[PDB]
Structure 1
Amino acid sequence: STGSATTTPIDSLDDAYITPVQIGTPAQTLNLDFDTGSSDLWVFSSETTASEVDGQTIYTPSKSTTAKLLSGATWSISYGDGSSSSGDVYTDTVSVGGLTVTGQAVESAKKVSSSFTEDSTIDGLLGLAFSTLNTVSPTQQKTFFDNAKASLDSPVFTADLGYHAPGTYNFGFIDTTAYTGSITYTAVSTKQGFWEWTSTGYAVGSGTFKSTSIDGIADTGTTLLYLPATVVSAYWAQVSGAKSSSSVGGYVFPCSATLPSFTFGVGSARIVIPGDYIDFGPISTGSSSCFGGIQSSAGIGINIFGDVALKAAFVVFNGATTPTLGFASK
């Protein structure tokens, strides 16, 4: 089997991407944030504290003939940005782009933090990291991908995120028309439960490539590119007037600037992030100070190849017995 679904930016900045997901019988379609940095599929639901729901579409398990309470199971998750959610668990039929899993754990939110409430466009998350990170207790549950894997034509999914435009998540096949050149594959460590890999270095603009190992995660659920302070300083030093602002919470730059590109290494290959991808616009409405798309990972504890980086590539998440990641230009 295979599946193919379009993923769409939630706003004009590409802050996140939503993908329609069918849950239950008859289908209830919710728009979920596919997150290769976590491993829970959770939704706003009829059980979510009413004051914490503001415009989201909810899953109502009582209206699904295939929903079953997973008795005794609870979940609770905290994300890197400080947001969180928790609740109980149903199993139900879940389909993405024509690919159906029966008996998928669907984690129903009883509580969500303010950032989720305030984002009316995101009805929940669909985790695509390794199932060892799943938070369901006392019986850990499998991700949608893990459940689908055996049935897929090939044990892979791909992320093809757009810049200010829709893109695609495919399951079970590699669309050879979706990228240019060849796909370069690189080793993955699953030790921390992430799609963790080591970039071979970077360049700023038309500058020379610096060969240096940068361990990080491929994370579709993180907006920006978070890299070591040394790398980030070297980038922003090429932008007149750019500075790190503790009050704003990162590097900012004059909105009048033209940003240089940023290149990262994948083995001997190179992925170029155009400068415009690094512009996250005014820090506040009407400001002439703009927020940068490359930020320091110092004090996160991990480097994160978030959407800024991934949307410059066609990315293969290979879930074979020995997992790997592939990157192609597009």
Structure 2
Amino acid sequence: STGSATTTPIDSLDDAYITPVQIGTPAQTLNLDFDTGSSDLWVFSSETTASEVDGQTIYTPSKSTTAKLLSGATWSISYGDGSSSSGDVYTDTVSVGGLTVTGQAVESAKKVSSSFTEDSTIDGLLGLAFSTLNTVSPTQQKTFFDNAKASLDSPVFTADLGYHAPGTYNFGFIDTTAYTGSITYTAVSTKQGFWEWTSTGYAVGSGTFKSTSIDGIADTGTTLLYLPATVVSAYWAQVSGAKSSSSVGGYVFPCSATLPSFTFGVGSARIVIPGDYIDFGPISTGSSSCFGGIQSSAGIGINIFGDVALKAAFVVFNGATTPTLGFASK
């Protein structure tokens, strides 16, 4: 089997991407944030505290003839930004782009933090990291990909995120028309539960490539590119007037600037992030200070190849017995 679904930016900045997901019988379609940095499929629901729902589409298990309470199971998760959610668990039928999994754990939110409430465009998360990160207790649950894998034509999914435009998530096949050149594969460590790999270096603009190992995760659920402070300083030093602002929370730059590209290495291959992908717009409405798309990972504890990097590539998440990651230009 295979599946193919379009993913759509939630706003004009590509702050996140949503993909429609069918849950239950008859189907309930929710727009979920596919997150290769976590491993829970959770949804706004008829169980979510009413005052914490503001425009989201909710899953109502009682309206689904295939929903079953997973008795005794609960979940609770925290994300990079301090946001969180928690609740109880149902199993139900879940389909993504024509690919169906029966018996999928659907984590129903009883509680969500304010940042979720405040974002009406995201109805929940669909985690695509390794199932060892799943938070369900006392019986950990498998991700949608994990459950689907044995039915797939090939045990892979691909992320093809757009810059200010829709893109695609495919399951079970590699669309050889969606990229240019060849795919370069690179080793993955699953020891922290992430799609963790080592970039071979970077370049800023038209500058020379610096060969240096940069360990980090391929994370569709993180907006920005978070790299070591040395690398980030070298990038922003090429932008007149750019500065790290402790009050804003990172590097800012004049909105009048033309940003340089940023290149990262994948083995002997190179992925070029155009400068415009690194512009996250005014820090506040009407400001002439703009927020940068490359930020320091110092204090996070890990480097994160988030959407700013991934959207410059066609990315293969290869879930074979020894997982690997592939990157191609497009």
- TM class by shorter chain equals over 0.9
CA distance in 2, matches of 1:120, 1:253: 29
- Give structure 2 stretches of 5+ with no counterpart: none
CA distance in 2, matches of 1:202, 1:81: 26
Shift of 1:147: 0.0
**Post-superposition CA distance 1:156-197 (Å, at most 9, x none):** 000000000000000000000000000000000000000000
Return the alpha-carbon distance in structure 2 between the equivalents of residues 223 and 80 of structure 1. 11
Q: C-alpha distance in 1, partners of 2:220/2:81? A: 14
Post-superposition offset of 1:289:
0.1
C-alpha distance in structure 1 between counterparts of 2:288 and 2:77, whole Å: 36
Residues 47-196 of structure 1: pairs in structure 2 closer than 5 A: 47-196=47-196
Q: Distance in 1 between matches of 2:116 and 2:89?
A: 19
Tell me how far 1:80 sits from its aligned partner.
1.0
- CA offsets 1:141-164 (integer angstroms, 9 cap, x no match): 000000000000000000000000
Indicate the RMSD between aligned Cα atoms, in angstroms. Answer: 0.2
Deviation at 1:292, TM superposition (A): 0.0
Check if 1:219 corresponds to 2:248: no
Segments of 5+ residues of structure 1 without an aligned counterpart are none
Tell me the distance in 2 between the aligned counterparts of 1:25 and 1:291: 43
Q: Report the counterpart of residue 21 of structure 1 in structure 2.
A: 21
Cα offset, 1:22, TM superposition: 0.0
In structure 2, how many angstroms separate the alpha carbons of the residues matched to 1:54 and 1:301? 33
CA–CA distance in 1 between the matches of 2:119 and 2:92?
25
1:49 to partner: Cα distance: 0.2
| Separation (CA, whole Å) in 2 of partners of 1:284 and 1:169 | 32
Distance in 1 of aligned mates of 2:81 and 2:180: 34
Deviations 1:211-230 (A, max 9, x none): 00000000000000000000
Where in structure 1 do 4 or more consecutive aligned residues deviate above 2 Å? none
Deviation readout 1:54-111 (Å, 9 max, x if unpaired): 0000000000000000000000000111110000000000000000000000000000
Q: Distance in 1 between matches of 2:96 and 2:82?
A: 28
User: CA offsets, 1:208-249, max 9 Å, x none?
Assistant: 000000000000000000000000000000000000000000
Identity %: 100
Q: Distance in 1 between matches of 2:13 and 2:253?
A: 16
CA distance in 2, matches of 1:223, 1:83: 15
- The residue aligned with 1:10 is 10
Count of residues in Structure 1 that have an aligned counterpart in Structure 2: 330
Counterpart CA distance in 1 for 2:163 and 2:83 is: 25
CA distance in 2, matches of 1:157, 1:83: 27
So what's the TM-score if we normalise by structure 1? 1.00
Q: Distance in 1 between matches of 2:197 and 2:55?
A: 37
Instruction: Compute the displacement of 1:278 (Å).
Output: 0.0
Q: TM-score, normalised by structure 2?
A: 1.00
